[PDB]
Amino acid sequence: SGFRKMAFPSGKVEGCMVQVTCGTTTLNGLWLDDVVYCPRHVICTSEDMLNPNYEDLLIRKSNHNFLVQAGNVQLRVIGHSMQNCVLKLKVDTANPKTPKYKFVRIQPGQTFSVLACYNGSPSGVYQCAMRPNFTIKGSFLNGSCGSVGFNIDYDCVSFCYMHHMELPTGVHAGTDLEGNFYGPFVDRQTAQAAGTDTTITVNVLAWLYAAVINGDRWFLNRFTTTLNDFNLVAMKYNYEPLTQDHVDILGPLSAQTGIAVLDMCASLKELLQNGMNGRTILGSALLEDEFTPFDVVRQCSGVT
Amino acid sequence: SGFRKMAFPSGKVEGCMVQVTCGTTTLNGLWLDDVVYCPRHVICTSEDMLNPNYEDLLIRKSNHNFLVQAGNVQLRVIGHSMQNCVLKLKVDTANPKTPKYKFVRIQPGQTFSVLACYNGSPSGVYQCAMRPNFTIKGSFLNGSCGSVGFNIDYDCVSFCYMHHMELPTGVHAGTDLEGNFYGPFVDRQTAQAAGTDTTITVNVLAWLYAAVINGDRWFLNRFTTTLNDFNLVAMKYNYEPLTQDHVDILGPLSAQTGIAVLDMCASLKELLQNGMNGRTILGSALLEDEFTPFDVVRQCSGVT
Numbered sequence A, B: 001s002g003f004r005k006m007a008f009p010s011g012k013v014e015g016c017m018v019q020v021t022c023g024t025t026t027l028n029g030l031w032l033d034d035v036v037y038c039p040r041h042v043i044c045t046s047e048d049m050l051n052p053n054y055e056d057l058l059i060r061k062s063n064h065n066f067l068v069q070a071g072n073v074q075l076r077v078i079g080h081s082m083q084n085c086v087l088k089l090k091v092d093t094a095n096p097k098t099p100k101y102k103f104v105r106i107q108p109g110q111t112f113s114v115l116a117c118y119n120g121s122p123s124g125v126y127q128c129a130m131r132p133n134f135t136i137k138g139s140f141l142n143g144s145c146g147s148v149g150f151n152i153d154y155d156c157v158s159f160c161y162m163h164h165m166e167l168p169t170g171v172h173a174g175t176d177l178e179g180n181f182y183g184p185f186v187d188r189q190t191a192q193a194a195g196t197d198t199t200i201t202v203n204v205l206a207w208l209y210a211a212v213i214n215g216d217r218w219f220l221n222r223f224t225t226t227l228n229d230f231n232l233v234a235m236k237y238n239y240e241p242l243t244q245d246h247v248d249i250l251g252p253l254s255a256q257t258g259i260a261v262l263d264m265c266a267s268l269k270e271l272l273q274n275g276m277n278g279r280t281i282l283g284s285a286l287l288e289d290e291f292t293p294f295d296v297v298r299q300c301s302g303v304t
């Protein structure tokens, strides 16, 4: 029992982290096989970031300008290329610690673990969600660029995020491992609208099921609702509309607790309309949306 | 910017996890050098747990009865001994992945990372605090026993906790790596009073400083207080009395923000007396006590 904001064990990713320096800029890189992946803004000075022409900036750089260090050992760079907003530095040595891996583009509302790094060294790991507006509320300081987000299924690390930028609002933006930004963001020091965010309804419902499994049941009521009625309330409270696909994903948790999804929706409706009344659910005084139904089943079943 | 419940990178600890089986019971062990550490209740059947005489139960066991497996490879056990509530299984091979390590007994109110494991395999990592009542609010299922808590300072892992038991109340109890329980707990299936818990005042103040550093300042007021006045309020709200040692530990955060510790105490006093009024601090609708002043400075400075 107990329910925590649990991250995946970071060991497989720690073995991939390297430092990349270009000129006066240093950030993190991800070394998989014989390629080092890093944010393309490593080639920029602070002045270049206002309106960078990355193609022109990269032309002034050669293999020997990218200093890649894995721990205390230097890697020899034999090729470089830009793919969207990432640089791919071909090295002469395959990382002996490369785990089984995949590059995936996650959907908004899904979760992942972040291994925050500085100078190629891991500092910490935390779990988070990709917001419906394609930002992440991470914990990142200057030098954290190139730190990655990932999920692990048995021995396979699915890399989904590479950190690039902190918006003036304090939220974070980044790319998939092919260098494509999540959201409308561009790698430039210019104010950028993140756009309206919403609460991940399916995740709040998953977390209410986690609460029931772990003993917190005070919010269960004698009511039910329909998808249409629930969605009128979701609209009012800036929650994502619940769909039958979301109900279907919640099936395993509904079977485990015996609480029909629409009955749990009615509990969520009452909580949205009345608040918590000074009470807590799983140690939180607000409705948590950073656990997917898969996360709840995994944490409550002990998948390794 | 951003502030998360960040755990230490778990890689160094992942390399130490093994499975230990004795008879029909399987749990996790920690392999450091040529010794495997695990909870002594591995020698018990479910029936034995009501009132176990561990000395007698261990006498019926020989080296060959403890099956230790690191991944898919079996370790040869050449010695066994009980130290308090842990078993130390001497193996013929030193763990090649042993990090630099220390065994430490943490104080109540300090924090640490937990690598939850099942069958010697890591499932997740999370951060938590040792409660003032010596319990931890973890996330542990059956088979998680032997999972460890730790802190990391550069290359040294300081192991502080080994998981042993879940109390009927859903909270967790365990030992230091010398097998001494934190708190009054005994390794027996008997109802056990955890005793009154309190809120870790110095940690809430540290987290309020983290909030100010990360932009959340709405709770700052025009007031100040004294240690005596603040402690009258702390008494009423079941908070630990604040001492000059706590004020001294908060020095670095007071210097970083320019907010005197007693002025931050007055903000905490107002929050305790008035509540949050539907507002949030660092994404939380309650006062967080699981970040120490050291955690706040580390996370806000990027120590690797």
Ligand SMILES: O=C(Nc1cncc2ccccc12)[C@@H]1CCOc2ccc(Cl)cc21
Binding pocket: A041, A049, A140, A141, A142, A143, A144, A145, A164, A165, A166, A167, A186, A187, A188, A189, A190, B001
């Ligand atoms: O955001 C950036 N770095 C950081 C990333 N995450 C957390 C940070 C916290 C504090 C300071 C810097 C942080 C860089 C520097 C600013 O100009 C830009 C503009 C665009 C891009 Cl892609 C990156 C950057």
Ligand SMILES: O=C(Nc1cncc2ccccc12)[C@@H]1CCOc2ccc(Cl)cc21
Binding pocket: A001, B041, B049, B140, B141, B142, B143, B144, B145, B164, B165, B166, B167, B186, B187, B188, B189, B190
């Ligand atoms: O608590 C124990 N195991 C667990 C530990 N953590 C989370 C659990 C969640 C669900 C079921 C078991 C869990 C064992 C089994 C019960 O009897 C005892 C009594 C004493 C001791 Cl030291 C251990 C144990």
